[PDB]
Amino acid sequence: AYEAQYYPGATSVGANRRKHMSGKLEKLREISDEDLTAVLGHRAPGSDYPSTHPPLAEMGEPACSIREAVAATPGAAAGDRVRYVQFADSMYNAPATPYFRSYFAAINFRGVDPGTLSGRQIVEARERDMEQCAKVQMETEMTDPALAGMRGATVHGHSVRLQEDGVMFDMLDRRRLEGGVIIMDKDQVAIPLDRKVNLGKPMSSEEAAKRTTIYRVDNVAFRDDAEVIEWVHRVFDQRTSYGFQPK
Amino acid sequence: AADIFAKFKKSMEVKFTQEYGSNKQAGGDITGKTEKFLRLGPEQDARKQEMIKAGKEIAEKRGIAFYNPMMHMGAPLGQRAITPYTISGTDIVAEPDDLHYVNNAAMQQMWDDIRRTCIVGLDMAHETLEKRLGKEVTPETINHYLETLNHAMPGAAVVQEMMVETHPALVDDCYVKIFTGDDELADEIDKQYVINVNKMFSEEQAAQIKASIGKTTWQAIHIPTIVSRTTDGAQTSRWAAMQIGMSFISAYAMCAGEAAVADLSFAAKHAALVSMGEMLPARRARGPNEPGGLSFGHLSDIVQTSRVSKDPAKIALEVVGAGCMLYDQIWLGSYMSGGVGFTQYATAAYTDDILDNNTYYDVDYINDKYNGAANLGTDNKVKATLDVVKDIATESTLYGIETYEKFPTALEDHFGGSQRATVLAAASGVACALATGNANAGLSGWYLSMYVHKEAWGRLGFFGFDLQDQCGATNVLSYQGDEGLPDELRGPNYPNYAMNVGHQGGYAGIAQAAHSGRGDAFTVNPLLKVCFADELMPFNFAEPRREFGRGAIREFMPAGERSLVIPA
Amino acid sequence: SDTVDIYDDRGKLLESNVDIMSLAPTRNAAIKKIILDTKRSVAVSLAGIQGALASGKMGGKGRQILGRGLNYDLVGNADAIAENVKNLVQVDEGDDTSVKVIKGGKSLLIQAPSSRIAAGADYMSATTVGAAAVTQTIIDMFGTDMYDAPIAKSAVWGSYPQTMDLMGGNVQGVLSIPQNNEGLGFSLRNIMANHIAAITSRGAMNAAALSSIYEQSGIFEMGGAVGMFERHQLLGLACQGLNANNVVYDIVKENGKDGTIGTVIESIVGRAVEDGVISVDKTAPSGYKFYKANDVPMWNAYAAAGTLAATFVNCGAGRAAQNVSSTLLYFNDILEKETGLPGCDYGKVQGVAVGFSFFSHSIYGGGGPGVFNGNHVVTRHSRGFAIPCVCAAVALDAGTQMFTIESTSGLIGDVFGSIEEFRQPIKAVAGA
Amino acid sequence: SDTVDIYDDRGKLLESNVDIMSLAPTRNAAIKKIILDTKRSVAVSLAGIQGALASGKMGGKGRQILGRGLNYDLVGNADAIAENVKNLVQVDEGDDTSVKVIKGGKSLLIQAPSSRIAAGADYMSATTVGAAAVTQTIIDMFGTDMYDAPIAKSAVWGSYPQTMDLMGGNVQGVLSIPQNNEGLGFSLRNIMANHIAAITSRGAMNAAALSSIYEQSGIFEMGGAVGMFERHQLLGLACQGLNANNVVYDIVKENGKDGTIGTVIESIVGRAVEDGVISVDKTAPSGYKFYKANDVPMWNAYAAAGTLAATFVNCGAGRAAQNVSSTLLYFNDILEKETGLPGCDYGKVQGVAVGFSFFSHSIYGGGGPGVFNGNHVVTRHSRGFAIPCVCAAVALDAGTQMFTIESTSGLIGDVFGSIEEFRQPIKAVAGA
Numbered sequence A: 001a002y003e004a005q006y007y008p009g010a011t012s013v014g015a016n017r018r019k020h021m022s023g024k025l026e027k028l029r030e031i032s033d034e035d036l037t038a039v040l041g042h043r044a045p046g047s048d049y050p051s052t053h054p055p056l057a058e059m060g061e062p063a064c065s066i067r068e069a070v071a072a073t074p075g076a077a078a079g080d081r082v083r084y085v086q087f088a089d090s091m092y093n094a095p096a097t098p099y100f101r102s103y104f105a106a107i108n109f110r111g112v113d114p115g116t117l118s119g120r121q122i123v124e125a126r127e128r129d130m131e132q133c134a135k136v137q138m139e140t141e142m143t144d145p146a147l148a149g150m151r152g153a154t155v156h157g158h159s160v161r162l163q164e165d166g167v168m169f170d171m172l173d174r175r176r177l178e179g180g181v182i183i184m185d186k187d188q189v190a191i192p193l194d195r196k197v198n199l200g201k202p203m204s205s206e207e208a209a210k211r212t213t214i215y216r217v218d219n220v221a222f223r224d225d226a227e228v229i230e231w232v233h234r235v236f237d238q239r240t241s242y243g244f245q246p247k
Numbered sequence B: 001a002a003d004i005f006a007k008f009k010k011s012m013e014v015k016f017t018q019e020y021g022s023n024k025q026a027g028g029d030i031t032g033k034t035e036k037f038l039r040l041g042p043e044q045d046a047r048k049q050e051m052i053k054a055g056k057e058i059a060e061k062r063g064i065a066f067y068n069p070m071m072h073m074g075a076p077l078g079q080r081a082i083t084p085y086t087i088s089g090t091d092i093v094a095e096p097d098d099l100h101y102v103n104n105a106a107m108q109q110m111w112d113d114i115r116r117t118c119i120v121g122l123d124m125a126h127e128t129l130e131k132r133l134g135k136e137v138t139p140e141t142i143n144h145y146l147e148t149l150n151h152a153m154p155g156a157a158v159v160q161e162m163m164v165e166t167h168p169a170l171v172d173d174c175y176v177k178i179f180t181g182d183d184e185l186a187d188e189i190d191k192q193y194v195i196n197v198n199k200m201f202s203e204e205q206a207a208q209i210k211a212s213i214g215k216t217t218w219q220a221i222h223i224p225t226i227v228s229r230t231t232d233g234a235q236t237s238r239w240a241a242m243q244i245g246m247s248f249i250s251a252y253a254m255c256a257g258e259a260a261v262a263d264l265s266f267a268a269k270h271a272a273l274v275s276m277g278e279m280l281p282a283r284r285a286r287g288p289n290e291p292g293g294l295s296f297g298h299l300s301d302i303v304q305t306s307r308v309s310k311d312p313a314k315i316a317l318e319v320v321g322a323g324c325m326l327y328d329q330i331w332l333g334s335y336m337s338g339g340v341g342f343t344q345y346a347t348a349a350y351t352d353d354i355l356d357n358n359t360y361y362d363v364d365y366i367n368d369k370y371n372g373a374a375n376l377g378t379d380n381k382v383k384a385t386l387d388v389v390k391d392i393a394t395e396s397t398l399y400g401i402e403t404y405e406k407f408p409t410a411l412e413d414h415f416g417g418s419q420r421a422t423v424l425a426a427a428s429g430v431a432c433a434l435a436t437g438n439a440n441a442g443l444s445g446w447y448l449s450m451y452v453h454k455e456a457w458g459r460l461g462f463f464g465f466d467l468q469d470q471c472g473a474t475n476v477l478s479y480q481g482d483e484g485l486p487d488e489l490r491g492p493n494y495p496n497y498a499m500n501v502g503h504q505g506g507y508a509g510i511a512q513a514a515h516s517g518r519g520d521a522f523t524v525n526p527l528l529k530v531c532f533a534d535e536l537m538p539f540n541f542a543e544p545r546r547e548f549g550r551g552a553i554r555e556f557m558p559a560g561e562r563s564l565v566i567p568a
Numbered sequence C, D: 001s002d003t004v005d006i007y008d009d010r011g012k013l014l015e016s017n018v019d020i021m022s023l024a025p026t027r028n029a030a031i032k033k034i035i036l037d038t039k040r041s042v043a044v045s046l047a048g049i050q051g052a053l054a055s056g057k058m059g060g061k062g063r064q065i066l067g068r069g070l071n072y073d074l075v076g077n078a079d080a081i082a083e084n085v086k087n088l089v090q091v092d093e094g095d096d097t098s099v100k101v102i103k104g105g106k107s108l109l110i111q112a113p114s115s116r117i118a119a120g121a122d123y124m125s126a127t128t129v130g131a132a133a134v135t136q137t138i139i140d141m142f143g144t145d146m147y148d149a150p151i152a153k154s155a156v157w158g159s160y161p162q163t164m165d166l167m168g169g170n171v172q173g174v175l176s177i178p179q180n181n182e183g184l185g186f187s188l189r190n191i192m193a194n195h196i197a198a199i200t201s202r203g204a205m206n207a208a209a210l211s212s213i214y215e216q217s218g219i220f221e222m223g224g225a226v227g228m229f230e231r232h233q234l235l236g237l238a239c240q241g242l243n244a245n246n247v248v249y250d251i252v253k254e255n256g257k258d259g260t261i262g263t264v265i266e267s268i269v270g271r272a273v274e275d276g277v278i279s280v281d282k283t284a285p286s287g288y289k290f291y292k293a294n295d296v297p298m299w300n301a302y303a304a305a306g307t308l309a310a311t312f313v314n315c316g317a318g319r320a321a322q323n324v325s326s327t328l329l330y331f332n333d334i335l336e337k338e339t340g341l342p343g344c345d346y347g348k349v350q351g352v353a354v355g356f357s358f359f360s361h362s363i364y365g366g367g368g369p370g371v372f373n374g375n376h377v378v379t380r381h382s383r384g385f386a387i388p389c390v391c392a393a394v395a396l397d398a399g400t401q402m403f404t405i406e407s408t409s410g411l412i413g414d415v416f417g418s419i420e421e422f423r424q425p426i427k428a429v430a431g432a
């Protein structure tokens, strides 16, 4: 059996990226089912999953060798709406970077629709499948609750200077340090909750530096990672050459 | 270059450490990683305040809801400080909102000046007269023709009785000049009508241009801005041809409508026409002289910096600026979409000297490492290889990235990943083009920059940013039918390029850079180079970035206003 | 001169030791027949014409001409109409003209004789002669006075020729009008994904196959398969579109229960190593292995195959078309990260997927996967290797979409889905 | 049933008692061959590519890329180029591919194999594959560095794909790109009159004949010849285009010395009366006789023949192409005044002629006769009966024009004017 190697590089940034891609992530905190549903903002905590179409078992499916070979997710089987979880991540050594969040989703989860932007990264999936993915991202070292935020809109902050308390700017103030812990009291589209969700203590600057998948010259400099630069150069040379003549 | 690096620092100081409006952003460090968010909202900014007041008053007057920042979800704009932009290479400090093309007459006029312009050869028409009518064309007949044409072109009659005409005071921006590679002919035409190649260009550039076009004679036609604004770009060549036709009839005592006249029409409309750009396919259907049709080479040639500067980097940077504005703000951000649009996607490449810093660093690096390859010259250039591109583009991008990291202000300036991508890739591409004199080597450099960027930060641009990126490297030197093309001939309709912000202006810059490094007189079309070598044009094509600044501070006077015939 | 075994959508062997050059649109009789049949065929909505006639609603969205009602029972007379239409469409008695009544008289299949295609520059004669035949039939059968002739005509032709197309009309084939082509040789690329999935009755592998045939015929017509590029494109066609050596189906099967984009990558790389297509070039200090391809076009074909298998797995799992845009992106992106080799089409599948993701999740244009095609500004850029996946994705959707196959493609499905070479394209190409 | 005798351009009988139905583009083997050969053929200017490579002047009017000169002796290597090009253009050894070196190595004729047409939606494969093969051959032959590949490619393809066409390139056929079509089924109508006259080497009757073939092929593809309209078009084609019963040639002969538009009308009306095509329907008080046609499509065909015969006489007398616009107008206008019958195409030839006259004598557009074609906004309106006269007129010009055949159509003429079916279209249609 082929075992994935994931990504080049011998620095901590390498080890972290490989952890993100493989899903070999340290659990750092807990979020209850109901609290997670609350912040996601797609339905009342504890409520049934609304549907977009009838369950597969109810409406039947066209004759298709692929449908027959590929098991529907629980969410697909039940006809759940496709909903999402979206995060912004600070360039100031947030553990996560957008691409690596997407790689984590694509590698570790079935029936997912990851999208990568500079200021935000999203996973769209059948609601119940999505939640399992959001849970992992939220509970593991992938998310720091200060340097990152779950944001479905108005995502601005990744590139902005930190607040003095080490929290990344949120135009809509969905989460903030209260009593040494990060509290999220609004949903991801900034509708106030009837609850304060305790996301636990943030990482120290020191810890985030060691856990980050981002390169920075004042931390782990990209300039110095000859192995990853080589990777880029190799792919570049191949793509260029083969576009002229694929041989 | 130390002078650019210092100028970048000063831009960061103005933007982030000096107060603007009521934003309370006095004091602080440009290298520090923290900020205090005062959540002041829009009122902290003087323009926003004025916009808010106008919106409320207009809503009230017209009786339907309108501009109201409280409609923004969650909170109104400006939860963090609203800070200004300095036009790169200048001391013009602009309100952000004043660089929206809608709000900025210099930007609108730049587009108008291009849209309303075409170039029409005179030789074919003269041959027609000689062959079909047996007329002799002399300097005197041409002089009379040009006087007629300068009367007729704005929309005035030369033939029929009982004609109505455009009001001259509405169309004062319309005129026709000629240029010619025939030095003897040039000396004999009334100077009022001549774009003097020998006066407008250096001796070397004039010789390149003349050798290119030979002894041919061309009309540089600029139809009324008011007409261009009422209609479209596809109007331009039609308008030109109509009045050329009437002027020939009048000036040469032809039959007012005979077979020979149709030959003049075909020559003006087709055989001897040079458009700014060609038509566009159905999905984005448009006729000629629209932004999408304007090749990167063409834009390089319209911009006149190449004519008045001997600094390859400066020349390329002006083209980048003109290009991001037109292609991103007007074309992609309006013609192809609309709404709030893409101001800051574009400003990132013409404000705060960030791009300039990276580029000028690159020039130094190249000169040090490749024996002055980036200096103006032809035989100092290095042959394009993968190795050269990997060296230059990688170095460029690393430096640009380190700058963004060492100056949190710069990172916050270019807050969008796409902006940073344009900046880094523009520098890389310009740098590669400067060293090699090969525009496609510039493109290779552009793409590699994107590749390095993505791996460094684990992010690149917006959702759709790198469609052309990922197709980019492989299509640089493809010779497949709908893949292969020198960057000079590429433009907004090159398939990979047809959709996304943050690229086209860079590609224009790269095309120019290949030629400005060489001290070349033009990038792809000498006809356009000479056409726009003309100070009578409202827009100062030699200094597009500054012009945008003049528009921001309300000092640019556009053509085409209708106040004459409007209630006072 | 590569040979492949061709397998159907259930992993059954159809044909052994097929030379890939025989799969060329320029050589393969079955593909040529698919192309000719596509060119010469159109659908007619008799129900649509009848409605337009009675209401005056013809010529486009919102349009209605008041006071000009014509009450003609087209549906009730569809057989007689089809017969008269055949007489008008045919060039010679007993030629290959065919006209079939579809869905109880609501619709017609019209297949113009191939002579019209031979005598034509393109394929529009099927539409123009088809519309002309239906117009003439209606006028004759129902006794339209000449002062009403314009109304009868436009019930069929819509707003043509004020519009460049038959806007608000009732005749259309699987292709679009030539003038919609972005590029030269693009007509066969201008087929909505929804159309493909309709015609193949939502059979995901068959959708991908039919799409590959059109796409590659497109690439061929674009001059994108000349010289060394011929092998290149046909390898992709075989391995991705025609389940060469059962690899696509096998990969799906092994990834069907618990597989992800990630595991499909492992399947592809594992095989490439086993089959000797790639080898380790260098081990980096970290232990990361940089690969090189021993056969570049063959590696590309593996990546193309992988891209599709990944689509089947990821869209399959979610029963959700939208997953296709990210599948194409991340399959290829992660593949490159895994190996240090270029992804499918040397970045161009990933490229399409970036813009396709954006244009299927944003305000700016595009839409759901079903609206895309090889002529679309967003998804044209790859050389045939992306759009088959999109057709597969659309086939697999269990009902997440607003722009369903039915909403865009119901007529096309009803009419063209009846044709066995279209419904079963792998069998068609394999001569089965 | 309708039969005619077919006579050549010198009034010699070629074939007797020919059913007009056998003259249909959809039925006539020789027409089909002309169309297929038209579709699959392109010209290549090796001299053009050579100078573009050397100078950097590629991609359109005024364009020059400085400092990228490539000095390749294409003209001197034309035989080897032609052979390499053939290898790339061909689909299978010994198919119907042809690549011929023209005028001492300055040009190539490329005839793409008909398989590329069969497998194509349209005709652009001849261009795209022809250009691809040339590009590939140049790269191969001269060892172009990949960093110069863009320059070599565009020397051939020009500004494509920034432009929709190969603007400022060196590969062109007789046709235009599909997207230039005004209407559906118009591609075959988009052939410049200058091209036709070049191909037929200025033989006026052959020019009209070939033009008629393309025009009617277009009308057919437009669905303009369905049902009763088939007889209508084919009578027109026979009598006007193919010198049915030697009528066109005979009228020219009797009007050759002293004839005018006026005497040509007398010729035509006299024959119509003699042959029983028209009869006096009513005598007015003044003695003026109102006619009616006993056979309306036949009368139309006489009017068509007369239009062309008048062109031959009026343009012929003046040796001046420009006379064609007035000829078409006044022949038909005066014919109606003479008879009380409709002119050719029930006013549509006259209508064409009005706008054509204006657009060949004004500031607004058009040009000399040579620029017009069945796809041109000005001259598209008649169902094939106007443009053949224009091609004749251009053929007859002794040197009044600025836009000479040579200036627009030299390459096309050098390349196409060789082939027999093109230079002898009446003989081709008739089977000699």
Ligand code: F43
Pocket: A117, A118, A119, A120, A152, A153, A154, A155, A156, A157, A158, A159, B338, B339, B340, B341, B342, B343, B344, B345, B346, B415, B416, B417, B418, B419, B460, B461, B462, B463, C361, C362, C363, C364
């Ligand atoms: C709704 C979208 C989805 C889409 O298709 N386009 C949007 C729409 C928005 C709208 C915003 C107007 C408004 O606020 O009502 C407009 C102006 C386009 C328009 N309709 O005129 C736009 N983006 Ni977008 N948009 C931009 C950008 C961005 C950056 C911003 C990231 C950050 O950290 O702030 C990210 C993409 C990324 O992460 O790379 C982005 C996202 C997205 N972009 C998200 C909204 C993100 C959010 O929830 O905050 N834009 C930029 O990166 C820079 C400038 C910029 C825009 C206009 C200008 O150039 O001045 C612009 C322009």
Ligand SMILES: C[C@@H](OP(=O)(O)O)[C@H](NC(=O)/C=C/CCCCSSCCS(=O)(=O)O)C(=O)O
Pocket: B238, B269, D359, D364, D365, D366, D367, D377, D378
């Ligand atoms: C005919 C075609 O021009 P082309 O042959 O150059 O393509 C086309 N031009 C036109 O159709 C132009 C039409 C508008 C102007 C003419 C309207 S008739 S009103 C003039 C009467 S008079 O006062 O001049 O006698 C174009 O696309 O520009």
Ligand SMILES: C[C@@H](OP(=O)(O)O)[C@H](NC(=O)CCCCCCS)C(=O)O
Pocket: B283, B284, B332, B333, B336, B337, B464, B498, B499, B500, B501, C359, C364, C365, C366, C367, C377, C378
């Ligand atoms: C994709 C296509 O839209 P449609 O899919 O045709 O609706 C196209 N728009 C665009 O490409 C928008 C480009 C500018 C806005 C996004 C820039 S990042 C157009 O309108 O023709």
